[PDB]
Write a protein that binds this ligand. Structure first.
Ligand SMILES: Nc1ncnc2c1ncn2[C@@H]1O[C@H](COP(=O)(O)OP(=O)(O)O)[C@@H](O)[C@H]1O
Ligand SMILES: Nc1ncnc2c1ncn2[C@@H]1O[C@H](COP(=O)(O)OP(=O)(O)O)[C@@H](O)[C@H]1O
Ligand SMILES: Nc1ncnc2c1ncn2[C@@H]1O[C@H](COP(=O)(O)OP(=O)(O)O)[C@@H](O)[C@H]1O
Ligand SMILES: Nc1ncnc2c1ncn2[C@@H]1O[C@H](COP(=O)(O)OP(=O)(O)O)[C@@H](O)[C@H]1O
Ligand SMILES: [Mg+2]
Ligand SMILES: [Mg+2]
Ligand SMILES: [Mg+2]
Ligand SMILES: [Mg+2]
Lengths: 371, 371, 371, 371
């Protein structure tokens, strides 16, 4: 059987086999095109680079992202990425391998139908399935009751689950993500004299965000300490040299998550979104929902985010009850681990979408047997 | 097929066949006319001498250079030189021999068109091509990534290439060359009592420059040592005798390359031109551009120029990265060797400009299929 | 009170009094140093020339620009220019005259602080202020709602304003300006045989750009008409004679604004920058933003730029709504006129930065009471 | 103070005091030695005659010229001439009189050092200076901008000056002078039957050149008129009688200046030398250089040389601009007048070379404080 698991995500692709511990292939989802003259002959150079090759040669070509937020906008590039992660990296023939895919909540209906058409016609898989990322995030921890806040690169969403029953009317989705956090860091870095406008310099800003930024417990006196002392500065070396210095911008970019007014959005922070989600459920299940808060996703690995979230949540909730946040040591690959666990149970082998059913019903069979 | 390679240059003509190791014919590009009365009869003496004959008989006739800087000014003399290097030296019929020519960057458009008209009509070649000298200089070393500084007799130019892609917006051209260096040596030799005003005495000054001058690592204390001791003097014997002595002018003429203010030009030296060229490219390719600096051309064979260039470049660039200069043992004929290599690949046999295309389109077909 | 208005800009300085119609002093911002021998005695010649004197004597000295892009790089030269425009041209004592200055968006923080330190200590002004150029450009037209595209010599920027409220998250800045347009014209003029390398010949190329270039409505068939007929050529007389001819380069240099790939930049044209800026605002204000597009700046006075901008904007926007561009007859001095209007209202007399406040708080008081 | 001015020249010595109108002593620079047996006793006749005495007694002794072209070849004779012009003619003691000397451009370095050694040791002057002749020629006319063509007896040179700044890289020197013009007249006079071989008959030929020769506006039809009519002949009376007749040789000797091929030199005429000098300067200063052409020197007082020079210059320069030549009524003593003016300014009293400086530094102090 040897089912396959693929996590498209947005900006990172994780693929592997079912029943393992960690994904076997991780690489960015980027497609590049040459930009310049192109003198000389005999080079035999390709017309498009996908994966780590574009990262290696990013100085002469332009980076483009097919996936954005949640909806896929470039289907030719997506077919290029799937061909690369099927023939070049995993080295497998998808003709005899069922696959499992993930999808964010509250997405256009045509996205699922087109994904099913492409997989069932271009690649000719025998079976396939689509599951929600945040539901799979609860399988990894081996739990049954809690509220999951899954923040990635495209969109952060919330969904409460109580003893194996979901509440579809208490699901909140917010666009704010790490891509807008990188853009904000790029914008506020210009006030010190550094200019980053090229699409190849967005990886430099992203790496700075991934290595230096952190979340402060309190903002007023942390800004006061950074305003007075110079003990909060670190140095970064650019690829060509010309080292730079970072001051109070170090802890200002991640703060946008709790105060989304820095970009111009009117929505509340993630602490108020998860409090409204808790208060949207039933009265007698809130006690169990408060003590089983789970964190997952790449954008949640800022230092001190668990303590800041705890401080604001207990600042809003009544003082009688107890509040805890579960930050597992692994928080990147929780979705993939849950998908691997789900794709191995003996009871799941009956919900595959066979090709006979697809042939008889058409692309509309997805809304029937999925969610 | 037996393609032909010709390198017009400025002051030296190298010609030969494709697939060999060294050019078969090297001779100056000079056309001379008799000056004096011409008594006696029965001599049967020609009215114009081209090539080494004018050098042998330079005492009675006047030397003239058709090519200058980059643009050709005497087309009748250029047709005389091409006829000499086609019938008298190579001993070949150009009717069944495609030819390859070289051209400096940033030249008038009419130069290419007139060269194509002359070759396709007066000589009736079946095919022809025009290539940039500094691009061909990278074929000889068997490399793909570096910055090439090609300094000859007419003009020195710079162009960066990264993995087979050129950057046309980072190309710098500077007039300063060896002809102005010979003129400066002629001017500063008068302060010791030697007068060289005749056009036939410019070869004497040129030979002195080619045999005695050298580049000093440091100028202040080298001028101090030459000012105090007399251990830096060499003797030269003129054709008629009257040996001469050279003192601190020995290392002063080549220094004009690094300080172009000695003649009156406002531009910076070649070390700052190549540093500005490096800084005009992208940020992440500068690391590979710094360690692949290539030297080519006749005027670059001064002793100690590689160490002086290294000292100034590392004096300007950040201390983190590494800087090296590649001075191959052969540096005259790098362009010809690259042209011979290029004119032998099987993949190049499709970019020839056929006569059918020239007949159908006209002289404007060059800007389409060249560069 | 008699407040003073100064517009540093980049390459042109406009100064005058508040409440007038036009600036009283316009002169280039250039500082020159002598280059040559300097024989003879009794001349009593200065060691540096600033203003129109350097333009008059540009044949023997070297021009240097302190201001570049946006940031000031030579503070000693800037203090020389301010001393010249305070004592030599305006003939005023700055001890009893508040001044108003302009600044481009997204600039280093230290630029404002150093400007405040210099003005408050070296010149001892009683009060001062700093305002954004594009905000002042809306005061001149007597409007409250529109989008302003201010393109000058250093940087072009965009900012939308709706009924007296700014949107800081929809501000775009692009380096591309007239200095890079002059450099491109200089580069493409070499293909006809003209060489302009001296810093004093950049004024010749600039004057050619200011007198001959124009924007074409369509590029393909305009290049076809210039390719076939010779009805698009004009003659220019150099200072020493030797008249020249300009062909299809006449309408090619200004086109770089709409296709910034001619130099190598990856950014989009100004029509797509202003379309992205419109789409970055709220949904119900776009209707009023489309019909109130305002043009300002020196580099916007190319013929046909309003019609070309209209054609591309209506080519991108939906066909239901109406699109208009307001090209006022005066477009140079719109910023100065707006500054004069702002510095005369009775309600503005409370936002001056007094010296008592500067003494008590220090140079950091600027970020509090400015923007 | 009463500074002294001396103009060595070549063939004529002018000396006098500073602040006067004309030189007080003019005499040829010639040293003669007796040739014949010398019978009789009691005559008390000297062994060498210097100055006008040798001219008076030239029939029995041999004339010799120490100075030639530019370099001094007979230092014992030069010390004899300076002793004669210091004790016999001026009747002054050089012990308390600073002196000023002149020197042609592009001369051997040892000439200045030996002149300084001789003056500072043999004559013990308190101070001295050396200046360029053509720079001093601009002081006499009270101007600041023009190009000076100074043609004398040894060498003619050119140098452009713009507003008190010299251009050392646009200085041209040509050997052709009046001594070669006298020799050519002597050579072409033999075709009519007159022989002049004695060194004492060179003064006869020189006086004929100074009294009869003139420059023709056009050469072809002037040679035609002299070939047909006999209205161009004048008579000269030799000291012993035997009057002679001069025909078309009258206007042929001065023509060698414009056609230097009559002797065998390859260089161009003075009109092309001054045109190349104008074109070697900057583009925007040529307009002011064309209209401020200045003539100086003895050899420039041929009739019609200003009109011939104007005709050729306007024949080469573009027709848009204006060309004028300033032939002041005095053109012999322009250099001396400029030296007298320079040696009287209060600002020049600080650039004297004192003996204390010479004692401390040595003969090499000249290259520091001169030019
Ligand atoms: N150690 C880290 N610290 C901060 N941010 C990180 C870290 N590692 C990854 N990220 C961010 O997480 C994002 C990747 O999220 P990912 O888990 O791949 O979501 P998806 O699978 O939906 O793409 C990247 O954009 C990166 O900016
Ligand atoms: N050994 C040498 N040392 C110094 N200069 C040299 C040497 N050999 C040649 N040159 C100079 O190089 C020039 C020839 O350059 P060349 O490679 O022929 O360029 P091009 O092919 O463009 O004419 C000559 O003018 C000569 O002055
Ligand atoms: N009539 C014109 N046509 C084209 N360009 C012009 C014209 N007048 C001025 N410019 C350009 O505008 C620039 C001056 O812009 P300016 O309004 O002074 O901006 P700033 O005040 O920021 O310096 C000059 O560099 C010049 O090239
Ligand atoms: N009236 C004249 N016509 C033609 N030539 C003259 C005349 N007067 C003088 N000369 C020439 O000018 C020369 C003198 O030049 P001079 O001004 O003394 O130069 P220098 O000072 O360098 O010796 C003499 O050789 C003489 O032949
Ligand atoms: Mg994810
Ligand atoms: Mg060469
Ligand atoms: Mg402006
Ligand atoms: Mg003289």
């Amino acid at each position: 059987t040897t089912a396959l698991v693929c996590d498209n995500g947005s900006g990172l692709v994780k693929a592997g086999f079912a029943g393992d511990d960690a994904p076997r292939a991780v690489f960015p989802s980027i497609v590049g095109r040459p930009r310049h003259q192109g003198v000389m002959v005999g080079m035999g150079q390709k017309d498009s680079y996908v994966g780590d090759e574009a990262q290696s040669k990013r100085g002469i070509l332009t980076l483009k992202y097919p996936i954005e937020h949640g909806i896929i906008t470039n289907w030719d590039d997506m077919e290029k990425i799937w061909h690369h992660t099927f023939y070049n990296e995993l080295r497998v023939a998808p003709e005899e391998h069922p696959t499992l895919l993930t999808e964010a909540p509250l997405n256009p209906k045509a996205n699922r139908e087109k994904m099913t058409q492409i997989m069932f016609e271009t690649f000719n898989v025998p079976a396939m399935y689509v599951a929600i990322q945040a539901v799979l995030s609860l399988y990894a921890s081996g739990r049954t009751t809690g509220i999951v806040l899954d923040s990635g690169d495209g969109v952060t969403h919330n969904v409460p689950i109580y003893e194996g029953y979901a509440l579809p009317h208490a699901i909140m989705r917010l666009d704010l993500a790490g891509r807008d956090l990188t853009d904000y860091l790029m914008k506020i870095l210009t006030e010190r004299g550094y200019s980053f406008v090229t699409t190849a310099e967005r990886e430099i800003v992203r790496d700075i965000k991934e290595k230096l930024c952190y979340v402060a417990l309190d903002f007023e006196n942390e800004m006061a300490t950074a305003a007075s002392s110079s003990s909060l500065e670190k140095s970064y070396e650019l690829p060509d040299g010309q080292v730079i210095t970072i001051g109070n911008e170090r802890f200002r970019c991640p703060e946008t998550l709790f105060q989304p007014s820095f970009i111009g959005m009117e929505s509340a922070g993630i602490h108020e979104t998860t409090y409204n989600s808790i208060m949207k459920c039933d009265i007698d299940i809130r006690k169990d929902l408060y003590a089983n808060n789970v964190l997952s996703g790449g954008t949640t690995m800022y230092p001190g985010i668990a303590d800041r979230m705890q401080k604001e949540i207990t600042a809003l909730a009544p003082s009688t009850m107890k509040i805890k946040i579960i930050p597992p040591p692994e928080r990147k690959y929780s979705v993939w681990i849950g998908g691997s666990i789900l794709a191995s149970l003996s009871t799941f082998q009956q919900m595959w979408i066979s090709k006979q059913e697809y042939d008889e019903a058409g692309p509309s069979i997805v809304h029937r047997k999925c969610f």
